[PDB]
Symmetry: C3
Subunit: 115 residues, 3 copies
């Protein structure tokens, strides 16, 4: 009913601008983003199959946090799947978890109305 959710996308830095535009059409008014790092770990054979090394790899990643209540989660995740999908790795992932409370500081209101 008055449920609030956070949608967190971690993805490569591109079409952020296309996303901002489509997420706007569907009801999103504000979001947060940060520049951070991604790291790929793969198991690899050391030469001669003697052992295993962990191939480490580092990337630049965008992280986007969007808390919502009235805009349904299926609609954020589905429009983001859409502008960000390319078929190549670095397309990223979306994490959804739930928010007990939201507080609007400039206006003191709480719960689903503070968004």
């Amino acid at each position: 009913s008055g449920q609030m959710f956070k949608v967190e996308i971690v993805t490569r830095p591109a079409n952020f601008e296309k996303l901002k535009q489509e997420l706007g059409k569907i009801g999103v008014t504000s979001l947060t983003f940060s520049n951070v790092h991604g790291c790929g770990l793969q198991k690899a054979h050391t030469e001669l199959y003697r052992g295993v090394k962990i191939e480490s790899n580092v990337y630049e990643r965008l992280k986007i946090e969007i808390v919502v209540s009235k805009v349904p989660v299926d609609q954020v995740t589905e429009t983001a799947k859409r502008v960000l999908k390319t078929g190549s790795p670095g397309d990223g992932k979306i994490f959804v978890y739930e928010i007990s409370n939201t507080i609007n500081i400039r206006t003191g209101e709480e719960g689903p109305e503070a968004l």
Copy 2:
């Protein structure tokens, strides 16, 4: 009972120093902060402006949550744009790396 919560504050990068006082005074022993960014989306054609923000994350169990939120509420307010918001969610477990403790004791 021994519930633990994360409180996430996203606000303009200002007044940080007093927010420290007022929180340490109610029992907050340590917090984490980072510089992020925030933007409004509007309208369809969409126009959006982007401002630097502070992301403050405090994890508590003993210090009542309700006492963190409104200590943040009272002190960060200015009525002007960029007071930001506060997101709270529940934490399943905390582990102290140095002590090995788990649960609210770890904090």
Copy 3:
């Protein structure tokens, strides 16, 4: 512990030992994580004494890889006895979507 569940393991710690950490997490089966350079703040009631540190932050979302295996691997590698060893926070993730393949839940990770 239980199938279907996904958890975000969140570690805030010293910048040190990050590389032995990647090594070992990589071996209990973690294939990717996110980290960022943040800061830690220390508070003390004396009026209050306030310190500022550089800390590292590691986010790992897991399901098929048990969370007790991740936390213990982290306690081990990161622990030095002294303060700034940092903490681990764990919380449940309702769902994960793999953008490139369209999959959801554990098979997405």
